[PDB]
Amino acid sequence: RTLQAIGRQLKAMGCERFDIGVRDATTGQMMNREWSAAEVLQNTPWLKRMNAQGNDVYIRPAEQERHGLVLVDDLSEFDLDDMKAEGREPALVVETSPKNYQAWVKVADAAGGELRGQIARTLASEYDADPASADSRHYGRLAGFTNRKKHTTYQPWVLLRESKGKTATAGPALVQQAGQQIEQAQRQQEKARRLASLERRTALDEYRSEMAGLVKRFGDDLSKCDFIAAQKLASRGRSAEEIGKAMAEASPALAERKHEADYIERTVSKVMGLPSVQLARAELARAP
Template identity: 30%
Template sequence: MPSERYDIRAVWPDRAAKIPSAMRTVSGDGLLALIGFLKAENAHGFNIIGRPVDPCYIFVDDISDATLRAMVSAGHRPAVIVESSPANYQGFFDAGAGIDHLEAKLLARHMAERWGGDPGSADAWHAGRLPGFTNRKVRHRRPDGSYPFARLRTASARIDPILAAMATELPLANSAEQKDQQGARGGALRNCAPAGALSGDYSALYGRLIAPYAAHYGSNLDRSRADYAIARRLLADGMPPPEVSLVLAASEKAREHGDPWHYIERTVSAAKSALGRERGAG
């Protein structure tokens, strides 16, 4: 996975022990120079994890071989797959250059939701196990006291076409300052779309749903109310909230909003709450 810098960490398996991690940010050449140190830390019981310092690499954790085959059949193309423990896999998928950490988080949550990955690992900067080092979790300890190695299964410089297509549809904040404000309050969507279709399908769906409102109200259309109504309808029809969020990403109101992530999240949350109250009353 080409990158100018890499985030490398030696992490103690038991977080409750509160043993400090060793963290390094290095170049590719610096990574090679770090191998001896990492081997020593691994031998002393630390897990060795890392990732490129580039949000374009979307991490998916805790998936099976069958899931990997299904992902490839659906059109996904992993950049790296590591067998992190026997018959358990982690992967990085390249969504293409130009996405920021908010967009990466959205895509990571999509992948976890869609493919049954670990939602706790679905963020922009989650690191995966480095192949060639042992997985030191207690549950993986063998009867002879040894531990299984993390093994590289796939490596390629290819871009994932599905994530790259989805990335082009994500609403962007208008300035770096707004993105900083979003990050400060957790402004990325808390959930993301789990659908198997390409994001262009969501845009088309939104277009079909907004059309009757636009035809009826014309220039008097309140797009916020229309988006709320669309969200309620989709939720009532059984669409998961993360997928509703991606449908609303095509909203003109969201794209014009100073903080599109917050607008979409607020709209879906309000629709979900109202629908829950309605069902509870029934």
């Protein structure tokens, strides 16, 4: 029955190539192989050996396979009833343990990773399924093997329950919805872009940023502006030299001097003597 189940599952999935995952439930050890459907069947003896030795057997379409299959994990029989009645008909259903199911939903003949991942999250949300399982590259279980990851008197079998292989009624609609949601996100991105436009950063950039706000409220005391900006830069770990050089280049109060060097030195000296600056710097020194 193992061979027959694998054969039906591969046909229902419909891919040319698959990733097969083999994981030791006790130890943690992992192997991944990429195989044609013919090669998966050719390797059934080895997979059964590995399963008997305590390994779970997993399956997904290969990377850069062109497909529209989306995995939905941790479903009840009632969840599947709802899915079917809403046009999210499974292309196949796998029982992973008693009363616990996975479905693969075919939304298109081909859909990129971007759309599939969005749909996976959408379907997991729609049916309150496992969100951690919702991504374009998540492994499902391969039918025909024992679940090694237990009942009283014994380890449950992974069973292929249905395997129609047909595109869901809502497939084209789910592809449209995903595209609309991505387009919406992109509009908000453009909004945030345009907003920042109206409103890589060195000591100089840091100084100018602080000043632009300080001169609006303290426009009659540009040296005070310097003092507050210097205090902020010094509290954030900037050097006395970094701050001096920034003032030398960009300070309006400095441009009035001459002398220049003395004003900078005194500004930096006063700032470095402040308990606030000393404590902030000491607390910074304890960070990586």
